[model samples]
Target chain A: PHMGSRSRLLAANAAAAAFYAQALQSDEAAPARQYLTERSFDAAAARKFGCGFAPSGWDSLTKHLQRKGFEFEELEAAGLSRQGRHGPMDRFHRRLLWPIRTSAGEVVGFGARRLFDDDAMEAKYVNTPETLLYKKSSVMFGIDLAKRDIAKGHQAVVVEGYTDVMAMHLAGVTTAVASCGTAFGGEHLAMLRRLMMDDSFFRGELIYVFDGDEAGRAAALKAFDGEQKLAGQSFVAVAPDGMDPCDLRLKCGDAALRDLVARRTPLFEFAIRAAIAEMDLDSAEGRVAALRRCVPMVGQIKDPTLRDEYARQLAGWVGWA
Target chain B: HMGSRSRLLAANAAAAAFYAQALQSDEAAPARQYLTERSFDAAAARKFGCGFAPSGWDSLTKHLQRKGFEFEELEAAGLSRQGRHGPMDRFHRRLLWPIRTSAGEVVGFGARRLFDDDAMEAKYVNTPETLLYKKSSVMFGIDLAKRDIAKGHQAVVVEGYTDVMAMHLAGVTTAVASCGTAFGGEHLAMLRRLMMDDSFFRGELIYVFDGDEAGRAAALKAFDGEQKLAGQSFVAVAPDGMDPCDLRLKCGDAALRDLVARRTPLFEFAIRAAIAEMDLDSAEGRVAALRRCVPMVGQIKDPTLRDEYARQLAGWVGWADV
Candidate 1:
């Protein structure tokens, strides 16, 4: 009785996942399949990741979960349905669905991407909101699959979306996960740390591989605050010319995708360099203000030797003693 | 209230000056001998403002009161305590190391017992939590190291006041230690503010611990707080259970400096220590060892490095083909 509701909620999400998986195979999901293939992902990869489709009707999942003895409240609680004027209706429709699972492999929720061009009123990507089993902040897409590799490799490669996780994994960079429709935060960090056994003496690294654009750089900087919670090193990897992993894989191939991860720069160095680059180093005032801006960062270095060397280099760069 | 705060600051400054004078006086020759034996030269002592708390209970109290301070003001400043008889000096027959704010103002004093007959059970005594001083937020030597740290030097965390003194004198100017308390979030926050740029991950945190079981245990516990740091963190252990102060005395300045230079990433040392604790002869032990090590490997952010560690683990467990 204690585990009844939570277990049933998971059961409903799993059943819905299976239903969507089957729905993607129908003739109606051909465009979605084509979209996947166009992105260099195929049927096997789709099946392996449990990619699916929500039928065009609003009640598709509502009816499906009801048939399995799940109450309307249960379906709604699992983020599978909503209360409509007519009745409880499916929250997702005419979309390509990717099942979100826990690190323990429990099917908990779904992340849906809009497939039809006519679904203009909806967001391109929609995920299950906070549920008894799924707290978006703490959930990572593909963690069930990536947890083993993340634990064994002492590394977690964080991409921005579900398909990126699929793209990286399909490329054999198996330690890949993504935040499900949220910015990476402390709870997500805590989850990753648990999976990676981050408290061990041999701390692992958390690499944020963001797209190479202004938005991506902004995101990398935003994530810098969270680095304080990580035991291992934190780095940022931007694709050449600001391409995301999916586009990079499609344009350059798998080796290039893997190489992108290999060339990550320490977030601190990147931040400092980026900060300095924004200033006009040719002007004396610009250089001094830049160095002043870097004082808080330089002062935090707990290693005297490294701090001294970095100070010397920074001073040289700024034309200061 | 404002005047009281200024009075406290003034009292501390005056006490520091008195301590500096006593450090050079003939009465402090024994304390001077102790410092020299521990590798602290006269210049080092004077530069760090090393001072002496005379044996009389009311010497500091009397001196401060003579300088226009009231008895109530003296006790309020944490420079003295009111005994059953009357006002008494807070520190007696000890060597005084003034703990200052990053702005270079003396806020408190961390005192070390110099005479064996001192009745205190603890070898070190620090100012009680006062309106001016909070133990959790203060780091000894921060006032001296602020400029060097602000210039981009890494902070070397040691266990004691003398260790911080020793490191700075040995040319490791960014050394600091928690004042009479375990290093905690407040201390990390203080260090972070001084460091300036939290976004730069290139900063490094080197923790120096003695090579003893207690030290190793403390180091492992310190790893729990590593999550609070943004920069790369490492651990440096001195040889033969020596701390920086003892190492400087027994060997020389170079050996002490060399130990800090030889630090490895905290994770690497932790992995080695974790593996060393397990028995490799038995299959069960090997499996446990492998499990213990798998997460460490998984924590490697670089794929190539992770694979390398995985391969090494496999080889150690006699499953190289894996």
Candidate 2:
């Protein structure tokens, strides 16, 4: 029975990887690349090809990684797959593979998770190390395509994962970008800040799109505490029914997905609701509990003036004596 | 010092009772003894005098019970004093005066406190329960004088120990009344019920006259609580600054007595205001409070019928929850 279950899980993971690859090859993958070339082609490439037209490079390396049992696929129905863009196929067999897409739709690198004979591997999230086409410092995952919209709309949305950006873009929202499996660094901000030079259109707004679910909300709150600056007014769009942007787009159609983003509320408002939901505020005891829970988040706000305003607002909301 | 303090306490008690008697007697005493011909004949009295006419022999014995103090008067006054009603000289000092008519006058009893005592002891209120009268059943001081009202004129009112005295003496024989005392159950239901039999009106109406002040408000509230029976209504009328007894004797006959009578449909007003204040749409909380308070004003036995009517009226108030 154990052997059969193992074989079945492996087959399912393989099927999911195949479907994810097929999904990428379809029309959905082309637009991000198309959007990138229009922005002066700083760098570009296509899938099914590799660096310098070498067929045996990144894909061979991914297959070798797969043979060593380091690939994990999330979907059981041909859902997602990973192989290095220029490596052998066997390296990423039945593994959860994160795709590396440039601002111009090229698969420059790959991030893969490892599945085991019995135990599944789990960790925070993994990414490909630096390589020839995939330079960590210079190339952000979605910028080449997202920059124009960021320029035109004067707003750029930053999210945590590559799939999150892909999910939003597939749902027809083009202004979203993400880091290369890293938190927002100074380099990313500098690149974004440079977009402001296209004075007529891209004096853009910056929004950090994070999950409204517990873990994501915590991360976003932390982001607010950090050095990442919002160039313009920032807003947050949480999935109403505990959906992340990517999964939600898949379940609901694109129009509904667009509405979800359009209804994004200001970050401070979202924080207040989140803070209240975390601690009850009805009774005296509950109010004290809420005040206790709120002190840390309040401390994280760097600006004294802004922090004081928020403190007063929260005191009023909690009906503090 | 102890002896002096004890004496002072006794004096204060005496003074309080005197004030209570003065407040009550402004109406109660004269209204008690305005006897009729039948009553006088039963007692075998030679003269049906309005005040202090001796009913021959058996009457003096019956008068003892009539002089006993009333408990309700003590409750209303919220005070204690000597010989509550007739134990002290303050009880019978007012002159025995009767309300008289234009054609003939009867000797009706009146009492006044003596002048030499402290100021508190110098006013007289009639003893309401007497051998010759039951104040609840009779319009005190008003028996013979109200003939003018029956003849189509409203009575003028005044307030003072001697105000009614001076008015009756000055020929305002058609005017009769009381002051400061609550319009008790016996007074209200009796007064308005009399008008019910009047050939000129559909139902009896009692118009209360007072100064437009807290005193008037208190009387109106008291009357509203007890006297407003179905088919019977009462109203208040007053001058901007003076009560009836004070106004009548001090101002003169030309001063018009403003009369407020029961005009609005009482039950409808009660139910409607209660319904308006309720938040019937949101939930049961507001409605529950309204329901609990509404039936308080309604004391009639067959209130189930009125409650049903109130429910329908509440629906008319546009409660979405209902």
lDDT for residue A67 in candidate 1, whole number 0-100? 81
Separate DockQ for every predicted complex = 0.02, 0.01
TM-score of 2: 0.33
- TM-score, per-candidate, Cα-based: 0.49, 0.33
Query: A1-321 in candidate 1: lDDT tens per residue?
Result: 533499888888889999999999888889889889889888899999999998987798788778878889788888899999988889888888899998888888998898887995468899888889988888888788888888878899999988789989988889989988888887888777776774565567888888765755685465345324452267778888877888889989999978888998766566666767777767645644555555444434444443444443554444431
- The per-residue C-alpha lDDT of model 1 at residue A189 equals 82
Instruction: Quantify all predictions' global Cα lDDT against the true fold.
Output: 0.77, 0.45
Q: Best-fitting candidate, measured by lDDT?
A: 1
Best by DockQ: 1
Give model 1's TM-score for chain A to 2 decimal places: 0.87
lDDT of 1 by residue, B1-322 (tens): 4337777999899999999888877767788888887878888888888999887779889888888888787777899898989989888878889999898888999988777778875888998988888999988999888888768657788999889988888888889999899887888777767776666533567888876675567546533432445226778888767899988878877886788789877666766777788887766676566555554444444444444444455455443333
Worst 10 residues of 2 chain A by lDDT: A48-57
